[PDB]
Amino acid sequence: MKASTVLQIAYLVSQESKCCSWKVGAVIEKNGRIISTGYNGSPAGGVNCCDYAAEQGWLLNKRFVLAKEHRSAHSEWSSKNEIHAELNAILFAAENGSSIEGATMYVTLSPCPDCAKAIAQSGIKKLVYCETYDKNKPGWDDILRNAGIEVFNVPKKNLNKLNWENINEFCGE
Amino acid sequence: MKASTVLQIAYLVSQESKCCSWKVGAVIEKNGRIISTGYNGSPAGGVNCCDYAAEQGWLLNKRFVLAKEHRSAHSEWSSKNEIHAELNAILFAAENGSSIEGATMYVTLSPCPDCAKAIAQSGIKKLVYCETYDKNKPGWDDILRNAGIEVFNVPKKNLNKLNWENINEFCGE
Numbered sequence: 071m072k073a074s075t076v077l078q079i080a081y082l083v084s085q086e087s088k089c090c091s092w093k094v095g096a097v098i099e100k101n102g103r104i105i106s107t108g109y110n111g112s113p114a115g116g117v118n119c120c121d122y123a124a125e126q127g128w129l130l131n132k133r134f135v136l137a138k139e140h141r142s143a144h145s146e147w148s149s150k151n152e153i154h155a156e157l158n159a160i161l162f163a164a165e166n167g168s169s170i171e172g173a174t175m176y177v178t179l180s181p182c183p184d185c186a187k188a189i190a191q192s193g194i195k196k197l198v199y200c201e202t203y204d205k206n207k208p209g210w211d212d213i214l215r216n217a218g219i220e221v222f223n224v225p226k227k228n229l230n231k232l233n234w235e236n237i238n239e240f241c242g243e
Numbered sequence: 244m245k246a247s248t249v250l251q252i253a254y255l256v257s258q259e260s261k262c263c264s265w266k267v268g269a270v271i272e273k274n275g276r277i278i279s280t281g282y283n284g285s286p287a288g289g290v291n292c293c294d295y296a297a298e299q300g301w302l303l304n305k306r307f308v309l310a311k312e313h314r315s316a317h318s319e320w321s322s323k324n325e326i327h328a329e330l331n332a333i334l335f336a337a338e339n340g341s342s343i344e345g346a347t348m349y350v351t352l353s354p355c356p357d358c359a360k361a362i363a364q365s366g367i368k369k370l371v372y373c374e375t376y377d378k379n380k381p382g383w384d385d386i387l388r389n390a391g392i393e394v395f396n397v398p399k400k401n402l403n404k405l406n407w408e409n410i411n412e413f414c415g416e
């Protein structure tokens with residue numbers, strides 16, 4: 071399917087995320103059909119990010135945003151509690167038994183180093199993203215290209231089938 | 244994932260359709276992840292609906308709509324040339340080897356009799372749709388319920404993450 075189409079599907083998927091910092095969505099497409107999806111969040115039996123941020127007082131009203139002064143505390147907690155969108159999409163394929171070899175991954179946000187190295191080793195041959203992650207540095211995609219993975223970008227401006235008024239991505243103050 | 248979310252994903256999927264009468268999208272979800280998708284269209288090596296309608300003069304400008312006087316000619320051609328969204332989603336699972344047993348199907352439009360009977364026999368246990376197909380009659384879903392399939396409806400009004408200005412469903416005059 072068209073890149074703009076799947077990317078926007080990844081954006082709808084991201085809305086299911088309970089993370090108070092960023093809402094990320096990932097879609098795995100094989101031969102034109104979606105065979106897996108994922109969004110960033112905690113595992114089973116684990117408290118959701120938004121609920122934990124509430125208890126910790128990391129949020130600020132108007133509709134809650136993660137306070138800049140607490141983003142650091144969120145990153146530390148998230149690193150060891152929230153599975154990223156890309157990995158969740160891949161994890162479901164392993165758990166369900168769906169081969170993603172040769173597939174294409176669409177993700178709302180450019181993958182962090184942990185996700186990039188996993189993607190490079192997953193069998194995925196193409197990665198398409200929209201926004202560039204907050205904490206990413208230049209050349210972050212080298213590991214993907216060296217693995218033989220094509221990396222493409224589609225700007226938000228080409229995505230006009232979504233009512234952006236109701237799509238939340240970055241949720242920090 | 245939330246019904247409203249997957250239904251809207253089915254709507255984005257429907258935009259890939261080249262049919263001049265209706266744009267239909269179907270999504271198969273298993274344990275919360277999308278494992279298959281489909282939209283109505285011709286098979287490989289087969290001329291697309293919009294292109295065939297153009298040659299036949301079935302269309303009317305403003306952005307082309309299927310003329311009411313030609314919908315009958317379209318239905319006859321479509322019946323033997325276009326695979327419906329629901330069946331395409333199921334066909335890919337059979338071709339790719341992805342079990343849809345116990346899965347849930349989301350489809351923009353209520354399935355026609357051909358699709359309903361196939362769904363009833365597919366192993367799918369839940370069907371969620373948005374709009375009621377033009378040519379459907381009451382009790383059309385009995386075959387699904389008798390097969391033990393739950394049937395739910397979500398009105399368009401609950402779907403507000405899409406910019407409906409850019410989503411085409413019914414394309415007739």
Ligand SMILES: O=C1N[C@H](O)C=CN1[C@H]1C[C@H](O)[C@@H](COP(=O)(O)O)O1
Nearest residue numbers: 091092094110145154155181182185
């Ligand atoms: O799931 C993805 N995909 C990309 O690889 C990067 C981060 N995200 C995540 C993890 C976390 O929930 C959030 C980033 O928030 P922080 O930047 O505050 O750690 O988005």
Ligand SMILES: O=C1N[C@H](O)C=CN1[C@H]1C[C@H](O)[C@@H](COP(=O)(O)O)O1
Nearest residue numbers: 264265267283318327328354355358
């Ligand atoms: O794919 C689906 N899913 C539902 O079962 C019903 C019809 N559709 C199709 C087939 C055809 O392309 C179109 C209906 O157009 P007509 O009503 O003009 O035949 O939508």
Ligand SMILES: [Zn+2]
Nearest residue numbers: 089090091119
């Ligand atoms: Zn979080």
Ligand SMILES: [Zn+2]
Nearest residue numbers: 154181182185
């Ligand atoms: Zn990551």
Ligand SMILES: [Zn+2]
Nearest residue numbers: 262263264292
């Ligand atoms: Zn058609």
Ligand SMILES: [Zn+2]
Nearest residue numbers: 327354355358
């Ligand atoms: Zn049908």
